[PDB]
């Protein structure tokens, strides 16, 4: 919905946004949105995600796909009406994203998902990318474990020529929806085959917002392989503006920079990570400064 | 509709256009068009806006979407017939834009929306863009508050990877229609994901006119993040009523304002600074030729 | 239809074409085609114009849109059959353009639409374009008034972020059809969003000049060559060079414009210079025969870069 | 249909092809094909031409469009079957081009259409093009009159912003079909708007063959306007390989080169034309050498 | 179908492939496949070829087009089922190419089609191309006559602005199917208009295999008249069984012949001259590596 | 499905992945997945592969195509539901790839398919490519024989102008499905026409490596990088780099090839050099662990220019 502001109510939002990343307990928002989802009466649609064609599939609170659902109009506070209808396993009426309000007046936030090694990490989508010899796949699994903390992280596998990997986009989005519905920390390996169909474009523009609203983090690997001049800009656009955070490799092997958006129209934070391999290629991450736009664009130009 | 002119009736229009920006009370036009919308008998379509596919959804005066509406033919003054029909939530007959006449003979104007810091600002669409370190999002919220004045401004959020942001274009246009139907000052953050579907092209070409006719202002951020750059330049140059663009110095912005159909564009400079929690404050008439304008556009 | 010629009948056509621009009374052709349209029995389709999709809408002599019309076959002189059918507000059979013969044997002309400041102006489409500081919008309104003369000119507004401007292409073509059906002098502001591409937009660019020249009316359209994208500027150049009957283009000096006029199908293009100035409330006033070769023409077009 | 050859029957074809251009009386072939068309029983389809969509409209011997026609299978000599069917004004079965055999064993010819100023001109399509100040429109009308000789030439008008000009492609092809069905010399002004829809591509590839088979000549103006690098190659391809003859302007105003294909796999002929204007811009053309491929490509590179 | 191999059965295939080009009598394979086609019971589909849309038309052994044919499932040796069905003149089920097995275990061959002037020529598709002043059309007719030998060659004409030339792709493929069904040596003039529709892409990828399986040769002219040049190079390099290309000297041509699946390509030089009425006469084993091959292709 | 991990269960997966390539018996995985397929009750869909249009055809355990199959919902361990439905010979519901779980918790592996000349080779797709004079076709047949070992290898032929070669994409994918369902070692000659693009072709390139690695079979495909068109060579590089489990590429010296093998999802790539020579009738014979970094890998890929 839309929101009205004056100087005073806008100042409050800014303070609340600052708290959502800087002072709230890590994982709080996820726990809150879990409660909201749990309170939804059983069978009610909560999440719609776009399939390859551009149509959408719909899930309930238990991550069960909804095949049929009678038309149902819900009137919001501001007067706006949201209608949801499902027929033959596809969304007839409604929109992509969260079908129940998980956020209320608390919008434009990057809810803190976890704290590791003295740094706070944001929910939403984290893209892991860059060039050089530093491996993406070992990093995303290390990050998934680290941000998981006490909790296990979920792995969605997609589009690699290895055993057990799904390569069908429609199964991929089904896995993602379920992961965001049930887990705080989610790893995607990889985002190469989405990088184009309507579903793929939708996913790139939707997933960051879906995750930030949930309070979960989606850690996606994206190897910038080809040199074709239009596709590299799509990698840069996904890295710059479709991701809540960016994790990018550097000139030195094992070393990564983390760039974190802290909130709608707020300054982006940067910190450096050191890593090393243990037995069987398991990577271990070793244990606040702002960044301007020219520094940001300088980092993007390494891709 | 079409309009006929001779020297005399054209001279009157020019005078009336000049007044609509320079001498009319700020917010007047919005208040007038509010009255026109309020006088529309209940259930009559007033606004149609294009969805992603290129079809259109239709709203009444209360910003309620119309699912069904019997065919209805209205004859204009010039003899042209406008037919409106809605079925299954979509426009069967009609056009995108305002479905009732908000303007009459008063066309080609940039109705003054507000006055702030000694400068008059135009209704229609304002695109906030540019490169460098000056932030777009804090500027649009500061501008929304400033032009709001006594009134609260409306915020439409779209296409950012942050909490509560809608990313579905069809919800986005629903929010916009409602905002223009009910509020004088409107902020859009951001216009990146529209920058391509039929709906997106329609919106870029429609929204400035929709807003200028209403007397409301739509302040939209557009971070120019490689040929599309021309689509950013075209949106900035010719699809926006005003342009707010960053400069070499951080916090400093130039405002370029179209004052009317075939009139000179005005320019003024804004200074800004941040307070607590990254809240931006804007500190408190010269014409610009085309070569100066194109020089400004070439910074994008 | 098609036309047969020998040396003699072709020479007559050339003479008649020369007269249609150089010696006929200004506005004559418009008055003649008005009479032809008026003689059409009521309800008969006269004009079809393409909408955004590429389908066509159809109008009668009174500029009323035709929703339904029984199939009807009309045999021309050369033996060619033109069938017209309309159903559910769209053309089922027929073609875009004039559905009745307004021209007969008199084809390939640029019928003189008006005379102003010692110069004759052609009917058809005039594109007003160019770069520099000289404003397009004030010029088209000044030209509309000047060529209007005793008559008011019609203004079609399209695709600007200002009050009352329609931005829907299908309403735009409805306005244009009505304008050409009822008025000799017509202003379009602006032609940017058609250059911004749909089937209707391509059709309009290729159709409108011929529609207007056949009517004897003039369509004065502004076209600001904004973007530097290398394919779109050629579409501006192509519209200026070959889809317009006349070209009005700005120069290095502010207020000064060159007018390039096609006088007839295989004929030399004429050029003259206009001076202008602003009065009160930004009202522009235009102040009061030489041929041009192709290399001079292409030289003029290369300023649109 | 297909044709079988040995050394001897192939040598005969070559001789017959040589005669069709060099020794046959000018206009002979047209008169012969007129007789063939006249002998077709009334109502039988003779010509199909593609409309904008790529569907085809069909005409009888009198240049009357056929709205409906029962399915009808005709067996050729070699065993090949040609089926023709028309329904709702469009071709259901059949092919684009001539629906009756106008040529028999006499194929690959450029039947002489006329003789003017000591030079023989070929039937088929002549494209008039080039850059510089020499006007295309006055040249095509002068050529139409000259090759017409005793006969009037037909003018098809298309795609110019002048009075009486049709701009609808479907009317354009209707005019062309009628012109080729009834007249030996045909002028098209202009071929700019076809230069893309299926109909336009079809027309460019079809018309030369349609005309050469009829023994009529189609003289089409084509101003090479824009500099866009793919469209100029389409102008070059139409000039080089879709036209039977090419008439192209030179460095000197009023002077034109004519390049004529004399037959399937035969040498191309070249000659120079001088012109001048009389009263009311009427152009007058003033009154055998072979050309190799490198000379031909050199001429094309002026476009 | 698929084939299984070990060292021994693979060695046999290689020997049989070598013989199919180097030692078998010229024209043998054509005569054998003629017998196979003749033994097909009347009305059974034998060949399917793609039309402009990408659908396929189907022919019987007599080169008669099949309008209707009941669904019919044939089980191959490896267990794979081939179903053929035709309805309303188009293939409902099946595949493009030969619908009856003409080859069996004998696959990957270039069956010798003829011997002329001391050189053996392969069946399949021969593309005649190149730049310079040496004419393509006279060469293909000379080659058609020479490889014909005692037999007349068939000429398919397509896409030239000359009398009697068909320009409709669907008639073109009908002519080709009939030619391959009934004749060993076939000339196509020209392959320019196919060089894009689904049918055209299909034909380029299908025809070489169709011809090599039949034991017939398709000699196609292709004048390389700006990126499509790669489509000409790809057709010349990998879609043709043999390549005949002009040289720096007029009348002189190089012939590059694939002798079999994964075998070395052979090269020889041809001299030609014109007689009366532009009739060309061709005057009367060395391997070539890949770098020499790519060097030849770079002249296009 | 999705998998949950902590440090400990992730460490186990890594160890199991290492074993799947380095210590398991060659061909083991194939034999295990054969058993899984054999235990599927008869008539149940096991494999779906995309045809030219982008629709999918479906096969049972015996490599028989399924024309019709009632809707059937199977619930996985994680709660995710997989529905399979076939009608009129095409997949109505389901996904491309394996329709039964062949892998369980054992994912991200490169199951060892064979051992030859002191080197272990991975299952999945091997692309054989490169420039220079070293022949692709003789190499793939030599590799098929060598990795076959005691077993015959299957040959799928596609898109060459030689006798008996199928050129229809829909037959090609039918052959491939059957090959992977019944044989451990599979040769494809060639992969040029799929790079020559339809939905089916794009699907196949992105699907086949995973299909094969999951089965424990190896698909050895030749891919001659012919044309110099700048977008198509990147599609060859992308297929070689990221769509293939292993890469076999020719070198400056004739007969010599480099083999680059992915050992597992987040693991180091291995490299070794092969020498070859021809015997009688052009039969190629291959003569009888070092890791490679990314910059060395990209250096190898840049030879395909
Ligand atoms: N123990 C170890 N030591 C050093 N480097 C290692 C390593 N284990 C893995 N790596 C590196 O990690 C990389 C593997 O991950 P990535 O390259 O980022 C994605 P990928 O597995 O190559 O799939 P892709 O084909 O989609 O790129 C390898 O290039 C390898 O060099
Ligand atoms: N207190 C403060 N002091 C200085 N700069 C600040 C600030 N708060 C925010 N900014 C600047 O404002 C910018 C944020 O606004 P935008 O220009 O719209 C980029 P964004 O919206 O965050 O990402 P996007 O371009 O993907 O939408 C940042 O570049 C940041 O440097
Ligand atoms: N009184 C006056 N004196 C000098 N110049 C004037 C003027 N009134 C108008 N102009 C000039 O006329 C121009 C307006 O016309 P144009 O710029 O050519 C098209 P536009 O109406 O601005 O729409 P566009 O900019 O979206 O294309 C202004 O840029 C201004 O410089
Ligand atoms: N009497 C005359 N003397 C010299 N040149 C003449 C002439 N009459 C006509 N011309 C030339 O002939 C040309 C007109 O024909 P063309 O340019 O070849 C096609 P066009 O009429 O310009 O339509 P186009 O817009 O499609 O190009 C003019 O450029 C003109 O210079
Ligand atoms: N008697 C002769 N002496 C020398 N050259 C001859 C000849 N007869 C024909 N030629 C050459 O053969 C060529 C004709 O064959 P092609 O190379 O196929 C070109 P085309 O088929 O005529 O046009 P196209 O490329 O548009 O198909 C001409 O270039 C001509 O110079
Ligand atoms: N006995 C032998 N000695 C040396 N080289 C041989 C050989 N047998 C085959 N070759 C080489 O192997 C090559 C054949 O394989 P490739 O060229 O790599 C693919 P192809 O089978 O030719 O199909 P393509 O050319 O359409 O891609 C020949 O070019 C030849 O040089």
Residue numbers in the entry:
A (entry chain B), D (entry chain B): 1 to 195, 207 to 298, 313 to 328
B (entry chain C), E (entry chain C): 1 to 195, 207 to 236, 240 to 298, 313 to 328
C (entry chain A), F (entry chain A): 1 to 196, 207 to 298, 313 to 329
Show passages lifted from the paper:
The lipid-enveloped bacteriophages of the Cystoviridae family infect Gram-negative bacteria, mainly plant-pathogenic Pseudomonas species and share similarities with the members of the Reoviridae family, including bluetongue virus and rotavirus. Their genome of ∼14 kb consists of three dsRNA segments small (S), medium (M) and large (L), which are sequentially encapsidated as ssRNA precursors into the icosahedrally symmetric procapsid by the packaging NTPase P4 (15–23). P4 is a protein of ∼35 kDa, which can assemble into a hexameric ring. NTP-binding sites are located on the external perimeter of the ring at the interfaces between adjacent subunits, whereas the nucleic acid binding sites are found in the central channel. P4 proteins are the only known RNA-specific helicases belonging to helicase Superfamily 4 (SF4).
To understand this catalytic mechanism in detail, we performed side-directed mutagenesis of the residues in ɸ12 P4 involved in binding the nucleotide ring and analysed the mutants structurally and biochemically. A specific feature in ɸ12 P4 is a hydrogen bond between the hydroxyl of S292 and N7 of the purine ring. The substitution S292A did not prevent ATP binding but completely abolished ATPase activity owing to misplacement of the triphosphate moiety in the active site. Hence, purine specificity is achieved by locking the base by hydrogen bonding to the N7 site of a purine.
